[PDB]
Design a protein around this motif. Structure first.
Motif, PDB file in Angstrom:
ATOM      1  N   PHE B   1       0.894  -1.238   0.035  1.00 25.31           N
ATOM      2  CA  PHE B   1      -0.205  -0.096   0.145  1.00 25.31           C
ATOM      3  C   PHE B   1       0.626   1.275  -0.177  1.00 25.31           C
ATOM      4  CE2 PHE B   1      -1.646   3.269   2.930  1.00 25.31           C
ATOM      5  CZ  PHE B   1      -2.681   3.932   2.268  1.00 25.31           C
ATOM      6  N   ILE B   2       0.600   2.317  -0.996  1.00 25.83           N
ATOM      7  CA  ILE B   2       1.277   3.387  -1.175  1.00 25.83           C
ATOM      8  C   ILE B   2       0.967   4.363   0.249  1.00 25.83           C
ATOM      9  CG2 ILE B   2       2.023   5.212  -2.579  1.00 25.83           C
ATOM     10  CD1 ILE B   2       2.979   2.640  -3.446  1.00 25.83           C
ATOM     11  N   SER B   3       2.079   5.007   0.811  1.00 29.69           N
ATOM     12  CA  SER B   3       1.656   5.796   1.876  1.00 29.69           C
ATOM     13  C   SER B   3       2.841   7.177   1.703  1.00 29.69           C
ATOM     14  CB  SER B   3       1.746   5.260   3.229  1.00 29.69           C
ATOM     15  OG  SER B   3       2.822   4.487   3.283  1.00 29.69           O
ATOM     16  N   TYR B   4       2.778   7.925   2.649  1.00 31.56           N
ATOM     17  CA  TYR B   4       3.373   9.103   2.647  1.00 31.56           C
ATOM     18  C   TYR B   4       4.160   9.260   4.004  1.00 31.56           C
ATOM     19  CZ  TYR B   4       4.707  14.148   3.348  1.00 31.56           C
ATOM     20  OH  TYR B   4       5.104  15.272   3.544  1.00 31.56           O
ATOM     21  N   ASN B   5       5.334   9.876   4.256  1.00 29.05           N
ATOM     22  CA  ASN B   5       6.165  10.100   5.432  1.00 29.05           C
ATOM     23  C   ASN B   5       6.608  11.569   5.090  1.00 29.05           C
ATOM     24  OD1 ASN B   5       5.439   8.074   7.088  1.00 29.05           O
ATOM     25  ND2 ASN B   5       6.889   6.757   6.276  1.00 29.05           N
ATOM     26  N   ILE B   6       6.818  12.344   6.512  1.00 26.87           N
ATOM     27  CA  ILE B   6       7.484  13.712   6.234  1.00 26.87           C
ATOM     28  C   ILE B   6       8.537  13.867   7.158  1.00 26.87           C
ATOM     29  CG2 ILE B   6       5.643  14.400   7.819  1.00 26.87           C
ATOM     30  CD1 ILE B   6       7.639  16.594   5.370  1.00 26.87           C
ATOM     31  N   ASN B   7       9.585  14.441   6.821  1.00 27.35           N
ATOM     32  CA  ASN B   7      10.926  14.232   7.466  1.00 27.35           C
ATOM     33  C   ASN B   7      11.593  15.835   7.495  1.00 27.35           C
ATOM     34  OD1 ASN B   7      10.981  11.070   6.062  1.00 27.35           O
ATOM     35  ND2 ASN B   7      11.045  11.573   8.247  1.00 27.35           N
ATOM     36  N   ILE B   8      11.679  16.369   8.645  1.00 24.63           N
ATOM     37  CA  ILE B   8      12.556  17.524   8.847  1.00 24.63           C
ATOM     38  C   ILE B   8      13.882  17.324   8.383  1.00 24.63           C
ATOM     39  CG2 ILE B   8      13.274  19.175  10.278  1.00 24.63           C
ATOM     40  CD1 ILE B   8      10.713  19.936   9.339  1.00 24.63           C
ATOM     41  N   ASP B   9      14.412  16.159   8.986  1.00 19.51           N
ATOM     42  CA  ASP B   9      15.863  15.662   8.848  1.00 19.51           C
ATOM     43  C   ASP B   9      15.754  14.847   7.413  1.00 19.51           C
ATOM     44  OD1 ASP B   9      18.510  14.682   9.119  1.00 19.51           O
ATOM     45  OD2 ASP B   9      18.349  15.238  11.224  1.00 19.51           O
ATOM     46  N   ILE B  10      16.825  14.200   7.367  1.00 22.84           N
ATOM     47  CA  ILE B  10      16.913  13.083   5.934  1.00 22.84           C
ATOM     48  C   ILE B  10      17.064  11.737   7.042  1.00 22.84           C
ATOM     49  CG2 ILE B  10      17.860  14.981   4.516  1.00 22.84           C
ATOM     50  CD1 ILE B  10      20.631  13.332   5.457  1.00 22.84           C
ATOM     51  N   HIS B  11      16.320  10.694   6.263  1.00 24.13           N
ATOM     52  CA  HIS B  11      16.340   9.538   6.708  1.00 24.13           C
ATOM     53  C   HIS B  11      16.190   8.413   5.743  1.00 24.13           C
ATOM     54  CE1 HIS B  11      16.003   6.372   9.974  1.00 24.13           C
ATOM     55  NE2 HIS B  11      14.912   6.030   9.388  1.00 24.13           N
ATOM     56  N   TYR B  12      16.935   7.310   5.552  1.00 26.36           N
ATOM     57  CA  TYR B  12      16.851   6.225   5.064  1.00 26.36           C
ATOM     58  C   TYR B  12      15.509   5.529   5.718  1.00 26.36           C
ATOM     59  CZ  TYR B  12      20.972   5.419   2.249  1.00 26.36           C
ATOM     60  OH  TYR B  12      21.964   5.280   1.255  1.00 26.36           O
ATOM     61  N   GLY B  13      14.435   5.557   4.688  1.00 30.28           N
ATOM     62  CA  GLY B  13      13.128   4.501   4.820  1.00 30.28           C
ATOM     63  C   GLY B  13      13.424   3.403   3.999  1.00 30.28           C
ATOM     64  N   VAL B  14      13.099   2.193   4.410  1.00 28.21           N
ATOM     65  CA  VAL B  14      13.537   1.055   3.694  1.00 28.21           C
ATOM     66  C   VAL B  14      12.076   0.807   2.834  1.00 28.21           C
ATOM     67  CG1 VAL B  14      15.177  -0.287   4.961  1.00 28.21           C
ATOM     68  CG2 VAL B  14      12.657  -0.268   5.607  1.00 28.21           C
ATOM     69  N   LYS B  15      11.986   0.337   1.653  1.00 27.99           N
ATOM     70  CA  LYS B  15      10.995   0.087   0.587  1.00 27.99           C
ATOM     71  C   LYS B  15       9.995   1.221   0.520  1.00 27.99           C
ATOM     72  CE  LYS B  15       7.818  -3.074   1.621  1.00 27.99           C
ATOM     73  NZ  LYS B  15       6.718  -2.058   1.939  1.00 27.99           N
ATOM     74  N   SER B  16      10.630   2.548   0.670  1.00 31.52           N
ATOM     75  CA  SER B  16       9.769   3.795   0.582  1.00 31.52           C
ATOM     76  C   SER B  16      10.772   4.878  -0.079  1.00 31.52           C
ATOM     77  CB  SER B  16       9.590   4.223   2.212  1.00 31.52           C
ATOM     78  OG  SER B  16      10.691   4.066   2.957  1.00 31.52           O
TER      79      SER B  16
END
Lengths: 539, 145, 30
Positions: B1-16
């Protein structure tokens, strides 16, 4: 890998939709882009790009060309010029888009933007951009994998932590990024018609008036263009002012030469109307409802407070004691030049010069002191410096050493007098200079031990190892000590690094293996010649 | 399922997938073109080692080298910092291309179904052995199987 | 710096029209 070759249409439409916002906050795929974008010169280029699994670089730019027009009425004209390149380079007066193929051959059936990453070029300062953005894109991010992936958990591969350390080495190693580009000023990037009209209105020598511009004196878009041009002019000149050199990207010498040049240029940026043509430009801005641009020529672009910010005009006279220290090659000249720069520090306090910055400049100057005494040491020829000559010149350079410490404890007296000055000003305490000088001296002085050490041996050897002053062995043993001094000499010389001192340690441990053999011999001759009585030759 | 995330910093999300926006122009102005005030980077999670290696290579090698050679900086002695950082960049590329050792897939969680797992957990925490009987009707339901 | 600040609406719509062109290769905002 190698897959189907994508078509021009899909990626062309994608980039056409992407560009205009990223370039001028809109435009909706301008036709100038599509003119040479559809051109065969670019077309075969992207065909090779997609097909060849070896090229992964490309550069699409759109220069807002500053077309110089010679027709009377204006100076320049804004223009649009799309540019195509298969190799990437800094485009002048334009920002570009690069595309890197994550897959050596890209197809449309898989998402093109998934198999290809986008870069966007910076024209203001590409190097500072690329550095800071790579940092803020990879450092905590590679850190996030350093923690999540368990690279610390698996110690079989310990090269990812080292590549993190070297990324850090880059990010904190080059921060200037070729800072201080020595931009002194720019042209007049304002509305061209007003400037040209004032130019013919004064080349007649008749004081350009309000009416000579006609209705343009009250035309709103005309006036707003004047305002925008003056605003960008103050942008680049405040840019040339905000250039605040640090000790790196050069040296403290270059830092205070920067102070020289900065001050002698802000002498003229105190106002910006000096030219009679720029005087009448001030006048016409006053006439053309841009009197705030006039007061800018007096206050904003008339950056007088720069002088107030840089009242530090006594470093100008500091450059002379520093230059005396620069030319100070003989040891006495070096010490008295340190005294001279110190006395003019007593002088330079009068100006509000940043003491943390100032005495970190003297930190750089102290490493420069190490460098110049290294030149003097090369004059001393530390590689094959002669023993007694060497300890004599160590008497010299060590009286220079505790004398550098004399006016260094005097630099602490300066710290006290700058305690007085902070009582009159106050500022941040961090102004370390603490040089590597002692380390050289350390190596120096430790070598001096060695020196005295073997001199303690050799001369005394000339008698003590000699029997009753054993011929066969002790002849070659005096040779042993002397040629061992040679072997420590042939491997340990003027080596600046501490590895020279380590090889010195190895040299003495083999040297003192020989020396302890000599001690065993002399103690053997001792004990076998003892037992007689106490008097003289017996004990 | 396609979703969204917000990051002030930078971060490695897996399969995202990720899109980074870092201000090319530090000052923020609405009149200034925001897209031309920002800097756009992006990333898809395929292999971060070659990701970083290839991207830094084809991003800094030709740009940096061409600009230092063509802007007259190679003729300017004010900063010999550039050759040192060229060697530094080269050793970055070497170390990052050498980053090809491990797939990094030692062990992953074993998914079966939430219902069976929770039934087994709740029937075992009491101190009893799970069997075919605890599930009850779930053992012969074709859809659940 | 904070002198004029782009509105939430304009930047958010810009991202809404920009993201699908990249993460879907020319798609529409999901």
């Amino acid at each position: 890998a190698v897959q189907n070759v994508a078509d021009v249409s899909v990626l062309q439409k994608h980039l056409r939709k992407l560009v205009p916002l990223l370039l001028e906050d809109g435009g909706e795929a301008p036709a100038a882009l599509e003119a040479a974008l559809e051109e065969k010169s670019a077309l075969e280029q992207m065909r090779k790009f997609l097909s060849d699994p070896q090229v992964h670089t490309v550069l699409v730019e759109r220069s807002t060309l500053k077309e110089d027009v010679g027709d009377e009425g204006e100076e320049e004209k804004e223009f649009i010029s799309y540019n195509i390149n298969i190799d990437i380079h800094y485009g002048v007066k334009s920002n570009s888009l690069a595309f890197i193929k994550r897959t050596p051959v890209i197809d449309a059936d898989k998402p093109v933007s998934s198999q290809l990453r986008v870069l966007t070029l910076s024209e203001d300062s590409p190097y500072e951009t690329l550095h800071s953005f790579i940092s803020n894109a990879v450092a905590p991010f590679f850190k996030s994998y350093i923690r999540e992936s368990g690279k610390a958990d698996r110690d079989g591969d310990k090269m990812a932590p080292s590549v993190e350390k070297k990324i850090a080495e880059l990010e904190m190693g080059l921060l200037h990024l070729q800072q201080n580009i020595e931009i002194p000023e720019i042209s007049l990037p304002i509305h061209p018609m007003i400037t040209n009209v004032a130019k013919q209105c004064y080349e007649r020598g008749e004081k350009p008036k309000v009416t000579d511009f006609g209705d343009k004196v009250e035309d709103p878009t005309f006036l707003n263009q004047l305002q925008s041009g003056v605003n960008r002019w103050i942008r680049e000149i405040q840019k040339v002012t905000k250039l605040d050199r640090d000790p790196a990207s050069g040296t403290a010498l270059q830092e205070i030469s920067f102070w020289l040049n900065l001050e002698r240029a802000l002498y003229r940026i105190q106002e910006k109307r000096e030219s009679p043509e720029v005087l009448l430009t001030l006048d016409i801005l006053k006439h053309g409802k841009r009197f705030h641009a006039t007061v800018s020529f007096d206050t904003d672009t008339g950056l007088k407070q720069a002088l107030e910010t840089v009242n530090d005009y006594n470093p100008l006279m500091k450059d002379f004691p520093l230059n005396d220290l620069l030319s100070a090659t003989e040891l006495d000249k070096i010490r008295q030049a340190l005294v001279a720069i110190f006395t003019h520090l007593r002088k330079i306090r009068n100006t509000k010069y940043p003491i943390q910055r100032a005495l970190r400049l003297v930190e750089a100057i102290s490493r420069d002191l190490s460098s110049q005494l290294l030149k003097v040491l090369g004059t001393r020829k530390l590689m094959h410096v002669a023993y007694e000559e060497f300890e004599k010149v160590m008497v010299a350079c060590f009286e220079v050493f505790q004398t550098w410490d004399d006016e260094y404890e005097k630099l602490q007296v300066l710290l006290r007098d700058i305690v007085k000055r902070k009582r009159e000003e106050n500022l941040k305490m961090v102004w370390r200079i603490n040089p590597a000088h002692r380390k050289l001296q350390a190596r120096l002085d430790q070598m001096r031990k060695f020196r005295r050490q073997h001199e303690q041996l050799r001369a005394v050897i000339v008698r003590v190892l000699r029997p009753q002053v054993f011929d066969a062995a002790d002849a070659n043993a005096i040779e042993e000590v002397n040629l061992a001094y040679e072997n420590v000499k042939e491997v340990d010389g003027l080596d600046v690094s501490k590895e020279g001192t380590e090889a010195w340690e190895a040299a003495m441990k083999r040297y003192d293996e020989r020396i302890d053999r000599v001690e065993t011999r002399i103690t053997a001759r001792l004990r076998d010649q003892l037992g007689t009585a106490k008097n003289a030759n017996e004990m």
